[PDB]
Point group: D2
Chain length 317, copies 4
């Protein structure tokens, strides 16, 4: 319940799309918290999207409904949407589209299609298509609140520090073009017989990233939430990640301790395990104590159905 | 204990480096199983490396010792090594090295350094440096067994399907060079006054990936292990991943069910939870039944110290 | 602006006829320029006055100008500016300068700078009449047939850009992270050459004059050249027979030579008979001074 | 292989002297070629026989060959091959062909193809003596000063490649996933031009001959050209005064003209006096037939 108030406060200011994003180690339940917050926010009439760059398609399993690239309404909710990212499917569509253009020339076309196939099969495309859709929804509106289940770290978010580098490189390209512009004219006269485009795209990207950065670094719009478990791994990790997000100047309004073993436990096993969870809980209330901390228990049931989802919802709110 | 025999069998054939790689959902304990298998294999005199593309640096937390990029001996073991990947640190080193070269020219150098800064800050570099080191150790020897804690999926391993695409594109480039080679000569005569390199690098990469693919698709060298939990998420996920690895023709010798609640449990909580874990266990013995299945319990202690590590070791062996 | 241009074999006196026509047109108040792509700088010898690249008034004439082309000088002149502008990168400036020197020393630059100034004055006004002493042939003027080739190649580049434009964006989103310029320059050149071609193919604006000698070489040559100029659709209003031995001659030598010149004159009045033929004699004096120039002027007019 | 090359103003008879020297050298058993970059195809008119690009025997001489340069033809010839080879991509072939036509029509191709065949025969053997009727000047021959510029630019490219080589690999590992060729061609050209320059600057191999007329134009011109050739360190073994009016002349016309020719002859024996001067008269007949050719031959030898 401890989180509700903070959320409510976040919603009002800076009218427009509000962003919420959960982060934490693998497991640890951030996809879970995302789905739950989506359901809760969708309970009040609100138009909320949950975007997921998960290739494992976790939201498919949690919701039990398949989701395409385009936003899909979920579970009879008129107002709740989820965006699943498949770079491969997209890629097939782009291939159809390209093939359509290349009819006049097969050789040019088979070549370009090959280059694309290689591009898609390259190691960067997951994270970079993730990037593309992220920017698409940072620039977007028509969604009252956006929940990123893309799992952020300072290291995944390192692209936020680019615009300055882009500035330096751009001024370099401008100096260069000024030096060159004279020479190429004399070559164009003595022996007759791209930059503006590179600068266009560079500047465009610079502005997109700068906007996104300004939105993310601003509360009243974006809320970063850490989710953790009472175990040293997730605690230390999320601490470091918190420090990197700090380096990007990002607000973290809340930490969520998850899968807590309930206070009623009897057999020695869960006795020991909960002793440990209490030690780690003191560790958490030490390191993360300056932040709002929420607690969710370890459910008797596995957390799957919308019922368990609404349950967790009320547990956080 | 059920896994030991299979491992032993894997070690003997195809003398050279033997590869073992664990995969599964976030959490689920694959870094854990990796560390444990590393310890176990290091117990018999064997030279074993555990490489981790984890930016969260899990092995630092589990072992409690810091690891650099170059292989580092761990915990008094003369024979046990772990490789942690930091792309950023590397990047700083590359920057020092570049700056050293650019002294004659600052403008060229500041530009190139800018391009690199942008490269490193780009969304692909984590996964692609992961790729680079992966290939480095596929091509490598002097390590008796290599354990990849890089978390593989069919989708991360999609780069294995490239060599054919590279073949098509290469033959395209050859046809092209044959068509061009005539023309450029007449231009070189009528109006006086890269390919071999592109083909060199393309072919080189093609052979590296082909070698790696052939090694990974071959038992007696590489063993892919899935680790799962008695929960629908990890089960379905690891099933799909198993199918993609199947598409790349990869052997999966073993599935490891982890964090099992021990058979002695009393209070109703763990009663319900273990009932569920049994249902999911039947689900597992159904889907994954054609594979060797190993069981590890949920430890009273959090799994951190080398003692818990050796414990889990004997539990699997 | 009216354009007059003389052509013919080496020697044969087209630089001479150019100078003379310049003087004659400058006699009536008219502003006339004689541009010369001669690296030989023949106009320097004929006029006796030195001429720079920029149009220079000649021989006390307020209205008569001539332009001499030196490519080397222009190159070197630009180099200084280049130095001033690219200080950093310092290495780049030296490379670019090297490319420039390599360019200037290349075999194309004479003819192509000739081309550049030609187009400069085809596009120009403020000169009532322009006289080109650049020596035209159909082969020198072959650049006039370009604009159609430029069209084909341009449409090729457009089809190409339309084919590429889709691919590049998709590549960009899959892997984040010149044509318009090439087409700009190509189209600009196409329009300059089309304009020039249209002016040159049009009388009331441009007059092409052939100059010849009563010898088979120049006759046959200028005939072929006439046929190429024909292929570009160019008017040739006049043929000028030059260095004719005057009708008063006595010793057997010039008797024989003038007999030959008469045979070749019938050859000329045969081949070139369909156009105006003018006759200039072989002057007792070498043709140098402005006096001989005005003399030849009145001889043609 | 020995090289002989004539130079001088338009007219002035260097094509003539070339043909004559060719005949004379072909009289003694010798294998001699006369190559001509004349688009005017003067040798076609002088010899009366047509000549293709490949060396053609002339006038029943087993040993006398001449090479006429037509660039257009060569281009067109290659186009067919290009078509046969690039079928797919079909679009590419049309673009490349367009670039080819655009190249051939460009103002540089005459002089630069002249250059190409020049280097072809400088590198060549199997011809005992080669006579270049391409009309040399220091300005035409300015390409000889390149190899040093090529050196500077090459070392620039090497420093550059060393600076880049480190960066590119690191970029490659950070983001997976021409010079040697440029240096190959640059160095090759540098060696060809250096060889040619060394041969041309060396007597016992190459003889540069200037031809002039007793008129201030050709005299001053060929003097300056002589000074440029001097700047490239070239031997000029002989000056040939041509079209001299014979000493038997009577009527006042040729009296005056030959007076002038004598003044200019003293000018020549002044400026060019330090080198061998040869004299050829103005022939009663136009110089065309092989008979007049052999005549001039004996006149020079
Ligand atoms: N409060 C909870 N009670 C019980 N199980 C939970 C709870 N929160 C999360 N889980 C379980 O933890 C597992 C990992 O959570 P998930 O959000 O899918 O991982 P990730 O955060 O890495 O995407 C899921 O199988 C989920 O069912
Ligand atoms: N047998 C086990 N008993 C108790 N805890 C375990 C066991 N195996 C794994 N864990 C815990 O599960 C968490 C996730 O495991 P880890 O391997 O770090 O995740 P990943 O596989 O995603 O790298 C770790 O904190 C680890 O301590
Ligand atoms: N009508 C003429 N009478 C006498 N000499 C002439 C006459 N026309 C030209 N010449 C001479 O012929 C030579 C070459 O003429 P020029 O016009 O310089 O050649 P080009 O036309 O090739 O430039 C000059 O020395 C000039 O003095
Ligand atoms: N010695 C000579 N006697 C008579 N006519 C000559 C003599 N030398 C050259 N000519 C004539 O002068 C004209 C031009 O000479 P040519 O050699 O063709 O010029 P270029 O040397 O510029 O090619 C030709 O028509 C030729 O007949
Ligand atoms: Mg998730
Ligand atoms: Mg891990
Ligand atoms: Mg002239
Ligand atoms: Mg000639
Ligand atoms: Zn219990
Ligand atoms: Zn007489």
């Amino acid at each position: 319940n401890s989180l509700r108030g903070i959320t409510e406060k976040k919603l009002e200011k800076k009218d427009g799309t509000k962003y919420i994003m959960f982060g934490g180690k693998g497991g640890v339940g951030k996809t879970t918290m995302s789905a739950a917050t989506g359901v809760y926010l969708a309970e009040k009439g609100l138009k909320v999207v949950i975007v997921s760059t998960d290739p494992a398609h976790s939201l498919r399993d949690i919701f039990e409904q398949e989701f395409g690239h385009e936003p899909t309404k979920v579970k009879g909710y008129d107002n709740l949407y989820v965006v699943e990212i498949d770079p491969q499917k997209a890629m097939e569509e782009y291939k159809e589209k390209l093939k359509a253009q290349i009819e006049e020339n097969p050789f040019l076309g088979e070549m370009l299609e090959d280059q694309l196939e290689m591009a898609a099969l390259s190691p960067g495309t997951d994270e970079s298509a993730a990037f593309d859709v992220f920017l698409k929804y940072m620039d977007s509106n028509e969604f009252d609140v956006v929940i990123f289940d893309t799992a952020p770290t300072g290291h995944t978010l390192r692209f936020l520090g680019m615009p300055e580098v882009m500035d330096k490189y751009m001024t370099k390209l401008i100096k260069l073009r000024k030096q060159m512009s004279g020479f190429m004219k004399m070559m164009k006269k003595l022996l007759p017989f791209d930059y503006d485009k590179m600068l266009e795209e560079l500047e465009k990207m610079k502005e997109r990233i700068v906007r996104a950065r300004n939105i993310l670094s601003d509360p009243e719009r974006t809320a970063f939430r850490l989710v953790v478990i009472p175990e040293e791994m997730s605690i230390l990790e999320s601490e470091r990640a918190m420090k990197a997000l700090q380096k990007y100047g990002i607000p973290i309004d809340a930490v969520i301790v998850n899968q807590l073993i309930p206070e009623d436990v009897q057999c020695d096993f869960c006795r020991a395990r909960r002793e440990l969870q209490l030690k780690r809980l003191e560790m958490i209330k030490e390191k993360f104590g300056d932040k709002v901390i929420a607690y969710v228990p370890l459910l008797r049931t596995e957390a799957k159905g919308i019922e368990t989802l609404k349950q967790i919802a009320k547990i956080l709110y």
